[PDB]
Design a protein around this ligand. Structure first.
Ligand SMILES: *[C@@H]1O[C@H](CO)[C@@H](O[C@@H]2O[C@H](CO)[C@@H](O)[C@H](O)[C@H]2NC(C)=O)[C@H](O)[C@H]1NC(C)=O
Ligand SMILES: *[C@@H]1O[C@H](CO)[C@@H](O)[C@H](O)[C@H]1NC(C)=O
Ligand SMILES: *[C@@H]1O[C@H](CO)[C@@H](O)[C@H](O)[C@H]1NC(C)=O
Ligand SMILES: *[C@@H]1O[C@H](CO)[C@@H](O)[C@H](O)[C@H]1NC(C)=O
Lengths: 105, 103, 128, 116, 114, 106, 105
């Protein structure tokens, strides 16, 4: 439901803020492909970093303010879409929060 | 014979299944899957608030069935509050939206 | 340290064409550190250890700290007319309930037809 | 329908029925705002020929055609001792009162899915 | 499909079964070339509790669900020295099963139905 | 589904019908559903009602203790045959709870 | 995904730069017809040069910088669209990189 509408710059890094829920172990930052109604997991607690994002992203969880932060290092035109974050084994059923990304260059 | 996978009362979806025997052989035993949704065309959007517009779109993610609601439950009571100005005394009073099921 | 994910698979479609036997596979992955064993019970009665053959924990193709194992079991082909569901189970220390009974049956699987019968009415409000 | 053909004014009714004894307080509000008592008329309990020892009452509200054609919503709250909550209400609008068309957008997905 | 909806990885298994003597060389190939064996894993032959003289094997190939759903057959091959040509292979995909028909029965009459 | 209890008459003169009594419901009917359309026509019900034809030969006695209600019909004719139902709620169809059959060997 | 969108002039020649992948033998420079959702192969390693481009295009592969270069000699208004390059037997399921072309005259 909520949209951070996070913004950033080409290069550098940008931090995505998403809520960390309880009674849900798998936490993911899925990317809304919006092609054939399918969303592909970019990162997960089960340890799966997409090949296109390998070595550029990380996921750190700390239940201090009930928040988990995901950082994306570097930036490319490809990195300018929707990255719905959520929980639960099913991916296209979670997407608790929706966010948008772009590039300023 | 048929087992029941889904008996949702909010969406009135009854997902069931059955395997039918073939023509005297253990092969090609085709499996089945019966789905029966009953759409209400008179219910509102916010089922517990009798002011929201009528319900036009019906989205059924079958995966979840096997929170916005569509139909009422015969085993439950729905209530709300309305201002009664009787005697020049505007007063919010509880009202049994779905009576006969609140007894 | 992650929850040991587990899965089960039914016998192959082309396997049910020689009329000798059938195999059911229970795949156990994760469980770091590698501490699992599977006991194949049916109707709550454990089967003989000679039927299911668990082998060993093996590291995943890309293994930071994860592992995996495979365990199968042999049944008779003619017994699948009733199913019996041939339940599988896993055990690990990194599980809140330390049991994840997993079972499948001829009925469970790929649907070969989808008989949807949706209806429209102006009296479904109550959904009796 | 014939009344709306004139495009002058529209009258909405509210028929309470079969309550014993006679003690029903009725009122009308428009989109959550109560209306003046002088904009509607309420009858008095009268005997019921079909049902011995039973009473019924009427109530009518009149508004302009434009108001009825702007999806404005009106309701008829009633109060009686028998009522379990002592108060119940019914509501209608342009789309719900004998509509001409049935616009529907039935949509389902992942019919196969994983069902257990 | 209980793993497909999770959209993490699609694991395909090749159940080599019944070869004697215990020698088999399974390889996974796609696009006309054998996929780097490192992407897949296999197990050594093991006995059965039935019949005198048999061995079984296993193999697991991990591919992202999306790539599996988009296309890709990923055939499996078995190299045993008793085959007619010493090479035998099987293949699967999304549409390897019986075609499913839809018996949709929409009813718009309120009188008809429940 | 719910039971399909069946009763007979063994020549006319009297008949007795019993159906389960649900809880938290105020309406109880015994509609005959003997119509070509299928729409059940309530014969004898609570909330005050009765059938134009069935009058003086129909009565209802609800017993919460036994979770049953009793309906007694005097005499017998050709019209009052076929099948009958029972139920509750405020929708004669979609609210049934039994499907009883009535027959007479006369 | 990346868009070289290399430009050029009427006449002369223009070089299209596309990535040369490994474990993929067929390499093509398909033209995105975008008519009925179909892409027609302009050139391939299997040796197929479209009739309209016969004798005007060439494909040279050299895994020095993991790049294969395709040159288009001459130029026509027709040569002003999208030429997605990719690999694999299925032409419509490849298109690794997308590019655009135009004419300056
Ligand atoms: C649907 O209606 C309900 C009831 O009005 C809404 O929830 C209520 O919100 C009010 C404050 O706005 C609270 O006083 C009530 O306690 C709430 N109800 C309950 C049961 O908690 C609800 O927000 C409405 N939904 C939408 C989408 O508008
Ligand atoms: C298809 O659905 C209809 C409606 O529920 C049912 O009457 C019919 O028997 C079904 N067919 C099969 C083969 O299950
Ligand atoms: C009918 O539904 C369509 C969408 O299916 C919508 O565009 C249109 O506004 C609806 N009609 C009315 C009167 O709202
Ligand atoms: C199609 O639906 C009808 C109605 O339910 C049913 O009688 C028939 O058997 C169905 N056909 C198949 C092949 O399931």
């Amino acid at each position: 439901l909520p949209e951070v509408k996070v913004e950033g710059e080409l290069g550098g890094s940008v931090t995505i803020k998403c809520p960390l829920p309880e009674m849900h172990v798998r936490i993911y930052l899925c990317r809304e492909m919006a092609g054939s109604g399918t969303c592909g997991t970019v990162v997960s607690t089960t340890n799966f970093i997409k090949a296109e994002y390998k070595g550029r992203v990380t996921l750190k969880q700390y239940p201090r303010k009930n928040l988990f932060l995901v950082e994306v290092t570097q930036l490319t035109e490809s990195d300018s879409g929707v990255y719905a974050c959520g929980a639960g084994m099913n991916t296209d059923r979670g997407k608790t929060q929706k966010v948008t990304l772009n590039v300023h260059s | 014979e048929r087992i029941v996978l889904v008996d949702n009362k909010c969406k009135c979806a009854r997902i069931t299944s059955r395997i039918i025997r073939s023509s005297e052989d253990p092969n090609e035993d085709i499996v089945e899957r019966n789905i029966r949704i009953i759409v209400p065309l008179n219910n509102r959007e916010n089922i517990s608030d009798p002011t929201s517009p009528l319900r036009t779109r019906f989205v059924y993610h079958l995966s979840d069935l096997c929170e916005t609601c569509y139909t009422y439950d015969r085993n439950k009571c729905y209530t709300a509050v309305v201002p009664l100005v009787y005697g020049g005394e505007t007063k919010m009073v509880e009202t049994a939206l779905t009576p006969d099921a609140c007894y | 340290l992650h929850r040991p994910d587990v899965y089960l698979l039914p016998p192959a479609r082309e396997q049910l064409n020689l009329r000798e036997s059938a195999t059911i596979t229970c795949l156990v992955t994760g469980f770091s550190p590698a501490d699992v064993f599977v006991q194949w019970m049916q109707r709550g009665q454990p089967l003989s250890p000679e039927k299911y053959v668990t082998s060993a924990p093996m590291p995943e193709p890309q293994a930071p700290g994860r592992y995996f194992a495979h365990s199968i079991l042999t049944v008779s082909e003619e017994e699948w007319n009733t199913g019996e569901t041939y339940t599988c189970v896993v055990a690990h220390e990194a599980l809140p309930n330390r049991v994840t009974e997993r079972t499948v049956d001829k009925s469970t699987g790929k649907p070969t037809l989808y008989n949807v019968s949706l209806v429209m009415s102006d009296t479904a409000g109550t959904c009796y």
